Ligand binder design. Structure first.
Ligand SMILES: N[C@@H](Cc1c[nH]c2ccccc12)C(=O)O
Ligand SMILES: N[C@@H](Cc1c[nH]c2ccccc12)C(=O)O
Lengths: 332, 331
């Protein structure tokens, strides 16, 4: 089974876009791939975090993934900080990474502009730890957002460079191109994809979001001023209404054309009620499962222990080979 | 309640009598009054390109030299840096509380950046943060550092103070170690004896044959005073003063008592005594060196003991660091 590695930032402010697009897909990949889900708490502290909230958010993202159907008997799920080998590899890789390769990074330049009060070394060295996270597990494939591509490319360059000196120690990872799921746009900026990080909170629906809160957000979803109003799919002219239909289709599994028939002669209000009703049905189901997981702290600690254990065994195979190659005395 | 002193030891098979009579013989003695921690810094070694076979050799050579000199694994903690994962774990967290500008303005980085320009690696930039982690992990009160490493100790202190300010008194704030002879080069006695000198006649290494020793001592530069006199005067009689320093440090005889012993005698007598005393010392060190260095099982057990102790200490601090910043504790 091919190994797929994914880094997961701590939050549990996953949207219906994270779920309908990617997570639902991940759940099904479990059967045919060896999936590895790493909650990246070490990367999280590259920006100042409230400690109590980081701890809560780490557990929230874990329980959310479990609620969505990621199964720790089929996937390896763990917390980055529970596996020392991540940082151990990153130090070795820092030594084989050019300074100029980190300073040329788009992400470093952008986060430096946004957080000029905390331009730390962690922020600069982010990509090497990311490289280490992937290379430790000999991953063949890694899904990354468009913003994280330069990071996956530098990972490949470091691995090839190290392999050119010492032999084929690392698998050169490739971008994972998904089955692809629901196209889910921002509710007030249909031209942009709904995003975890967005400042305007009317753009997103969160997985843990309340039914009356969902209803408000959908109520104020941007729609065109066509007169009369008509519920028809047209991304060019009716991005607002088309998104609502993509959401409805995704959740109900009803073809878009059938939804058009259903809403012939209805107002945008009717379409918005259906979308809120159907999204809140899905979310009620997710949330009930989340609440079971999140409140069973003994279960969560056991899942994390099992997962870190599995992760450490695999990571150690790679790291030992690295440590042998560069010339370290092996611990006995 | 013994105060903790932390020293980073670069892998090397080439220590000299200047190393031994300067710092090392004193570290051996202070094992009684201090909690001494000796970390062989193999992770720092690879910030510059290393021969793997030579790195592995130099790691075990330096450990066996330390043991030979008297560093005792039941009294001190002696270990290989790469054997203790907590060093890299802490250094990541410290990166997140260390400003880019702080590393940018290190003198060592600027010098190397002018020399190597675009060829420099991230390791050389970040070296001081791992060094800070090395020290802070063990709650070290004192650290001996060279002049060229003073800036690295200052930034360690800044980082630790900063972290404490945010999260409470987690780190001890390290200070420079306070309180052997300054052994000079045999053919250029204004220069300190350096293990990495290209003139091998400048140096006596610890693993040197006693006939090679007599050769180098006989050839040591003196002066052309008329009359020649065995008298201590670093300015005017550097070479003779240096032989007197060697002899004094090796025998524990004060310089004034040696001056008396060599009253009316010649430089040749002084050189004979220095050669005889140094070769006696090195014989005894060499024998111990070969006993430990050839005994792989023993070296494995000593490194394992060392790493088990270092990990136990390191974890106390690292657990508090990981809790403070907000991580879920492994269970
Ligand atoms: N940088 C990723 C998170 C991440 C860390 N390590 C990774 C390794 C593989 C994929 C993703 C990651 C993000 O911004 O979300
Ligand atoms: N930088 C030191 C080696 C070292 C690494 N970590 C240390 C901690 C304390 C003292 C020295 C060190 C040297 O060049 O010699």
């Amino acid at each position: 089974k091919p190994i797929v590695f994914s880094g997961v930032q701590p939050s549990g402010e996953l949207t219906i876009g994270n779920y309908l697009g990617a997570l639902r897909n991940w759940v099904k990949m479990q059967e045919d791939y060896e999936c590895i889900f790493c909650v990246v708490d070490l990367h999280a502290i590259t920006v100042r975090q409230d400690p109590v909230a980081l701890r809560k958010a780490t557990l929230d993202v874990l329980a959310l993934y479990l609620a969505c159907g990621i199964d720790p008997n089929k996937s390896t799920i763990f917390v980055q900080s529970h596996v020392p080998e991540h940082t151990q590899l990153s130090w070795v890789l820092n030594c084989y990474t050019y300074f100029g390769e980190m300073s040329r990074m788009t992400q470093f330049k952008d986060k430096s502009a946004r957080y000029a009060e905390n331009i730390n070394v962690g922020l600069f060295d982010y990509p090497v730890l990311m490289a280490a996270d992937i290379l430790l597990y000999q991953a063949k494939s890694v899904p990354v957002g468009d913003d994280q591509k330069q990071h996956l490319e530098i990972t490949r360059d470091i691995a090839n460079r190290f392999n050119a000196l010492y032999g084929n120690i690392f698998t050169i990872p490739e971008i994972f191109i998904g089955k692809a799921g629901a196209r889910i746009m921002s509710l007030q900026d249909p031209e942009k994809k709904m995003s975890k990080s967005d400042d305007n909170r009317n753009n997103v629906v969160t997985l843990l979001e309340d039914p009356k809160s969902v209803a408000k957000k959908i109520k104020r979803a941007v729609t065109d001023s066509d007169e009369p109003p008509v519920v028809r799919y047209d991304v060019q002219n009716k991005a607002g209404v088309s998104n609502l239909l993509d959401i409805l289709s995704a959740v109900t599994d009803k073809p878009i054309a059938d939804l058009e028939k259903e809403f012939e002669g209805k107002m945008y209000g009717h379409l918005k009620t259906a979308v809120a009703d159907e999204v809140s049905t899905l979310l009620a189901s997710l949330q009930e499962r989340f609440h079971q997981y999140r409140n069973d702290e003994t279960l969560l600690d056991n899942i994390l222990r099992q997962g870190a254990e599995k992760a450490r065994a695999k990571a150690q195979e790679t790291l030992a080979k690295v440590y042998e190659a560069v010339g370290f005395v092996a611990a006995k």
